[PDB]
Each structure stands twice: as structure tokens, then as C-alpha cells.
Amino acid sequence: SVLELGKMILQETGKNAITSYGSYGCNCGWGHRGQPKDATDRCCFVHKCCYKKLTDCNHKTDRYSYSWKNKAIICEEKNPCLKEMCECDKAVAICLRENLDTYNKKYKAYFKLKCKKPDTC
């Protein structure tokens, strides 16, 4: 759920998931859709398309088990839908971390700004 996702984003990026990423660009922002503005927003579109596969569990509110051990996120969960939910979160948190060198605080409040139509997953 979002509590595991927010914690991995903190662990990997040092950032506050709600405020730094919850209205960024065209895909990271909660509820946002559209073509990606940068690599950071691209990680978010990839993350959506990974969630879209989860039919037997809810990515927002079902909680899963994972450890942050030796600076890495390990998904220790065994219910299968929950383990893929953990793999989808782990991957966005890693991708965010890698592309932090281009985040850009101006896409940062992007709820009202413009977005071409999104590609297909």
C-alpha cells in the first residue's frame, strides 16, 4: 500500500513522497495521466503500468512485507499479488533515485498544467 511505497521512496531518495512526487509532472502525481515530461515522470508512468497488472490485490491499501537491508529493498512478501505489488514499488523507488539528477521542482506543481496524451503501457 501507500505506506510501503512512501517509505521506500524516502529510503531511496530522501524525499517526502506526497510533497515532492504526489503532483509531479504528468504521471507521478496522484490521479495524473499523460505523456511524461522527464525521466522522473517516466518512472511514474512505468509504475502505473506495473500496478495495472495487479488484479487480485489493491495497490493503495493492501500492506505487504519488505525489508530495507544493506541499502537495498528486499520484497519478502509471499502472497503473490502482494509480492508483485512490492516489486512495482521497489522499481519506482530505484528509478526515482537514479533520475534524481534531473528532478525539477517546476513540474513539481503540475496538477493544472498541460499534458499530451499518454502512451500505452
Side-chain angles (χ1 to χ4, degrees), residues 7-25:
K7 194 153 186 66
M8 289 193 189
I9 276 167
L10 182 60
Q11 288 161 155
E12 289 278 6
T13 74
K15 251 55 181 143
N16 186 306
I18 299 202
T19 71
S20 295
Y21 291 109
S23 277
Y24 191 96

PDB file of all heavy atoms in Angstrom, residues 7-25:
ATOM      1  N   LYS A   7       7.629   4.970   2.251  1.00  0.00           N
ATOM      2  CA  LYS A   7       8.834   4.568   2.997  1.00  0.00           C
ATOM      3  C   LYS A   7      10.023   4.173   2.125  1.00  0.00           C
ATOM      4  O   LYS A   7      11.055   4.809   2.296  1.00  0.00           O
ATOM      5  CB  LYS A   7       8.489   3.473   3.981  1.00  0.00           C
ATOM      6  CG  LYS A   7       9.632   3.292   4.992  1.00  0.00           C
ATOM      7  CD  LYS A   7       9.139   2.731   6.353  1.00  0.00           C
ATOM      8  CE  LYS A   7      10.164   2.638   7.501  1.00  0.00           C
ATOM      9  NZ  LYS A   7      10.684   3.921   8.032  1.00  0.00           N
ATOM     10  N   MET A   8       9.798   3.396   1.048  1.00  0.00           N
ATOM     11  CA  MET A   8      10.811   3.078   0.061  1.00  0.00           C
ATOM     12  C   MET A   8      11.154   4.351  -0.618  1.00  0.00           C
ATOM     13  O   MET A   8      12.298   4.543  -0.897  1.00  0.00           O
ATOM     14  CB  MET A   8      10.169   2.280  -1.053  1.00  0.00           C
ATOM     15  CG  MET A   8       9.833   0.864  -0.518  1.00  0.00           C
ATOM     16  SD  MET A   8       9.421  -0.171  -1.960  1.00  0.00           S
ATOM     17  CE  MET A   8       8.779  -1.724  -1.297  1.00  0.00           C
ATOM     18  N   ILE A   9      10.244   5.172  -1.011  1.00  0.00           N
ATOM     19  CA  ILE A   9      10.705   6.416  -1.636  1.00  0.00           C
ATOM     20  C   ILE A   9      11.547   7.250  -0.688  1.00  0.00           C
ATOM     21  O   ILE A   9      12.580   7.848  -1.000  1.00  0.00           O
ATOM     22  CB  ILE A   9       9.472   7.227  -2.021  1.00  0.00           C
ATOM     23  CG1 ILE A   9       9.109   6.642  -3.346  1.00  0.00           C
ATOM     24  CG2 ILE A   9       9.812   8.735  -2.352  1.00  0.00           C
ATOM     25  CD1 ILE A   9       7.715   7.136  -3.690  1.00  0.00           C
ATOM     26  N   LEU A  10      11.138   7.360   0.543  1.00  0.00           N
ATOM     27  CA  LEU A  10      12.095   8.020   1.489  1.00  0.00           C
ATOM     28  C   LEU A  10      13.492   7.362   1.624  1.00  0.00           C
ATOM     29  O   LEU A  10      14.502   8.057   1.861  1.00  0.00           O
ATOM     30  CB  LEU A  10      11.538   7.923   2.899  1.00  0.00           C
ATOM     31  CG  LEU A  10      12.417   8.611   3.981  1.00  0.00           C
ATOM     32  CD1 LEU A  10      12.647  10.096   3.811  1.00  0.00           C
ATOM     33  CD2 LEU A  10      11.697   8.522   5.284  1.00  0.00           C
ATOM     34  N   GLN A  11      13.491   6.038   1.701  1.00  0.00           N
ATOM     35  CA  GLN A  11      14.701   5.262   1.948  1.00  0.00           C
ATOM     36  C   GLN A  11      15.600   5.457   0.763  1.00  0.00           C
ATOM     37  O   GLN A  11      16.845   5.570   0.931  1.00  0.00           O
ATOM     38  CB  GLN A  11      14.506   3.761   2.106  1.00  0.00           C
ATOM     39  CG  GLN A  11      13.862   3.585   3.418  1.00  0.00           C
ATOM     40  CD  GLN A  11      13.145   2.271   3.664  1.00  0.00           C
ATOM     41  OE1 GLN A  11      13.051   1.959   4.833  1.00  0.00           O
ATOM     42  NE2 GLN A  11      12.668   1.537   2.694  1.00  0.00           N
ATOM     43  N   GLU A  12      15.022   5.437  -0.431  1.00  0.00           N
ATOM     44  CA  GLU A  12      15.908   5.546  -1.596  1.00  0.00           C
ATOM     45  C   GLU A  12      16.251   6.991  -1.987  1.00  0.00           C
ATOM     46  O   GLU A  12      17.346   7.178  -2.514  1.00  0.00           O
ATOM     47  CB  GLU A  12      15.361   4.799  -2.793  1.00  0.00           C
ATOM     48  CG  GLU A  12      15.423   3.271  -2.658  1.00  0.00           C
ATOM     49  CD  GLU A  12      16.799   2.671  -2.995  1.00  0.00           C
ATOM     50  OE1 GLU A  12      17.704   3.476  -3.206  1.00  0.00           O
ATOM     51  OE2 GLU A  12      16.987   1.419  -3.038  1.00  0.00           O
ATOM     52  N   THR A  13      15.303   7.928  -1.922  1.00  0.00           N
ATOM     53  CA  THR A  13      15.510   9.279  -2.471  1.00  0.00           C
ATOM     54  C   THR A  13      15.716  10.399  -1.410  1.00  0.00           C
ATOM     55  O   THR A  13      16.137  11.534  -1.709  1.00  0.00           O
ATOM     56  CB  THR A  13      14.343   9.651  -3.388  1.00  0.00           C
ATOM     57  OG1 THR A  13      13.219   9.942  -2.524  1.00  0.00           O
ATOM     58  CG2 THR A  13      13.962   8.634  -4.427  1.00  0.00           C
ATOM     59  N   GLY A  14      15.342  10.092  -0.185  1.00  0.00           N
ATOM     60  CA  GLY A  14      15.407  11.048   0.932  1.00  0.00           C
ATOM     61  C   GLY A  14      14.247  12.004   0.850  1.00  0.00           C
ATOM     62  O   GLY A  14      14.200  12.956   1.618  1.00  0.00           O
ATOM     63  N   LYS A  15      13.351  11.816  -0.081  1.00  0.00           N
ATOM     64  CA  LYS A  15      12.312  12.806  -0.288  1.00  0.00           C
ATOM     65  C   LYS A  15      10.998  12.328   0.348  1.00  0.00           C
ATOM     66  O   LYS A  15      10.697  11.119   0.519  1.00  0.00           O
ATOM     67  CB  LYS A  15      11.999  12.689  -1.722  1.00  0.00           C
ATOM     68  CG  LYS A  15      12.395  13.765  -2.689  1.00  0.00           C
ATOM     69  CD  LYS A  15      13.822  14.191  -2.756  1.00  0.00           C
ATOM     70  CE  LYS A  15      13.882  15.296  -3.816  1.00  0.00           C
ATOM     71  NZ  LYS A  15      14.857  16.231  -3.298  1.00  0.00           N
ATOM     72  N   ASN A  16      10.155  13.333   0.561  1.00  0.00           N
ATOM     73  CA  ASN A  16       8.758  13.171   1.056  1.00  0.00           C
ATOM     74  C   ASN A  16       7.870  12.751  -0.119  1.00  0.00           C
ATOM     75  O   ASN A  16       7.752  13.469  -1.142  1.00  0.00           O
ATOM     76  CB  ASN A  16       8.353  14.502   1.626  1.00  0.00           C
ATOM     77  CG  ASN A  16       6.975  14.477   2.321  1.00  0.00           C
ATOM     78  OD1 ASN A  16       6.070  14.077   1.682  1.00  0.00           O
ATOM     79  ND2 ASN A  16       6.761  15.034   3.500  1.00  0.00           N
ATOM     80  N   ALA A  17       7.249  11.551  -0.075  1.00  0.00           N
ATOM     81  CA  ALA A  17       6.643  11.103  -1.365  1.00  0.00           C
ATOM     82  C   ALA A  17       5.458  12.056  -1.736  1.00  0.00           C
ATOM     83  O   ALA A  17       5.235  12.356  -2.921  1.00  0.00           O
ATOM     84  CB  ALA A  17       6.128   9.652  -1.219  1.00  0.00           C
ATOM     85  N   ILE A  18       4.657  12.448  -0.754  1.00  0.00           N
ATOM     86  CA  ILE A  18       3.461  13.301  -1.050  1.00  0.00           C
ATOM     87  C   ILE A  18       3.846  14.607  -1.641  1.00  0.00           C
ATOM     88  O   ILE A  18       3.285  15.079  -2.634  1.00  0.00           O
ATOM     89  CB  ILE A  18       2.627  13.565   0.196  1.00  0.00           C
ATOM     90  CG1 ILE A  18       2.096  12.253   0.774  1.00  0.00           C
ATOM     91  CG2 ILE A  18       1.594  14.707   0.078  1.00  0.00           C
ATOM     92  CD1 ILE A  18       0.857  12.254   1.677  1.00  0.00           C
ATOM     93  N   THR A  19       4.742  15.245  -0.986  1.00  0.00           N
ATOM     94  CA  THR A  19       5.035  16.550  -1.462  1.00  0.00           C
ATOM     95  C   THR A  19       5.975  16.658  -2.627  1.00  0.00           C
ATOM     96  O   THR A  19       5.816  17.525  -3.518  1.00  0.00           O
ATOM     97  CB  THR A  19       5.553  17.461  -0.328  1.00  0.00           C
ATOM     98  OG1 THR A  19       6.839  17.204   0.182  1.00  0.00           O
ATOM     99  CG2 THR A  19       4.583  17.662   0.849  1.00  0.00           C
ATOM    100  N   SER A  20       7.009  15.893  -2.657  1.00  0.00           N
ATOM    101  CA  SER A  20       7.892  16.002  -3.849  1.00  0.00           C
ATOM    102  C   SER A  20       7.334  15.290  -5.077  1.00  0.00           C
ATOM    103  O   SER A  20       7.707  15.666  -6.206  1.00  0.00           O
ATOM    104  CB  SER A  20       9.264  15.379  -3.551  1.00  0.00           C
ATOM    105  OG  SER A  20       9.969  16.102  -2.543  1.00  0.00           O
ATOM    106  N   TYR A  21       6.581  14.228  -4.892  1.00  0.00           N
ATOM    107  CA  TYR A  21       6.142  13.420  -6.041  1.00  0.00           C
ATOM    108  C   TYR A  21       4.661  13.235  -6.245  1.00  0.00           C
ATOM    109  O   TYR A  21       4.175  12.743  -7.277  1.00  0.00           O
ATOM    110  CB  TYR A  21       6.552  11.985  -5.976  1.00  0.00           C
ATOM    111  CG  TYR A  21       8.069  11.883  -6.139  1.00  0.00           C
ATOM    112  CD1 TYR A  21       8.801  11.543  -5.026  1.00  0.00           C
ATOM    113  CD2 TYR A  21       8.648  12.150  -7.338  1.00  0.00           C
ATOM    114  CE1 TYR A  21      10.176  11.559  -5.113  1.00  0.00           C
ATOM    115  CE2 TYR A  21      10.022  12.187  -7.386  1.00  0.00           C
ATOM    116  CZ  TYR A  21      10.771  11.873  -6.305  1.00  0.00           C
ATOM    117  OH  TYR A  21      12.114  11.714  -6.481  1.00  0.00           O
ATOM    118  N   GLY A  22       3.890  13.696  -5.333  1.00  0.00           N
ATOM    119  CA  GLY A  22       2.425  13.464  -5.470  1.00  0.00           C
ATOM    120  C   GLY A  22       1.614  14.398  -6.335  1.00  0.00           C
ATOM    121  O   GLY A  22       0.427  14.105  -6.508  1.00  0.00           O
ATOM    122  N   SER A  23       2.222  15.393  -6.943  1.00  0.00           N
ATOM    123  CA  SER A  23       1.618  16.221  -8.010  1.00  0.00           C
ATOM    124  C   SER A  23       2.669  16.470  -9.080  1.00  0.00           C
ATOM    125  O   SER A  23       2.515  17.418  -9.841  1.00  0.00           O
ATOM    126  CB  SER A  23       1.411  17.623  -7.449  1.00  0.00           C
ATOM    127  OG  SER A  23       0.199  17.595  -6.737  1.00  0.00           O
ATOM    128  N   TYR A  24       3.749  15.730  -9.143  1.00  0.00           N
ATOM    129  CA  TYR A  24       4.744  15.990 -10.188  1.00  0.00           C
ATOM    130  C   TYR A  24       4.291  15.497 -11.555  1.00  0.00           C
ATOM    131  O   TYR A  24       3.807  14.348 -11.811  1.00  0.00           O
ATOM    132  CB  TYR A  24       5.948  15.195  -9.741  1.00  0.00           C
ATOM    133  CG  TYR A  24       7.246  15.473 -10.513  1.00  0.00           C
ATOM    134  CD1 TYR A  24       8.140  16.399  -9.951  1.00  0.00           C
ATOM    135  CD2 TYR A  24       7.536  14.831 -11.724  1.00  0.00           C
ATOM    136  CE1 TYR A  24       9.332  16.703 -10.601  1.00  0.00           C
ATOM    137  CE2 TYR A  24       8.739  15.141 -12.382  1.00  0.00           C
ATOM    138  CZ  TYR A  24       9.616  16.074 -11.799  1.00  0.00           C
ATOM    139  OH  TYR A  24      10.779  16.412 -12.395  1.00  0.00           O
ATOM    140  N   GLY A  25       4.606  16.372 -12.483  1.00  0.00           N
ATOM    141  CA  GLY A  25       4.538  16.009 -13.922  1.00  0.00           C
ATOM    142  C   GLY A  25       3.194  15.467 -14.348  1.00  0.00           C
ATOM    143  O   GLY A  25       2.147  15.715 -13.737  1.00  0.00           O
TER     144      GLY A  25
END
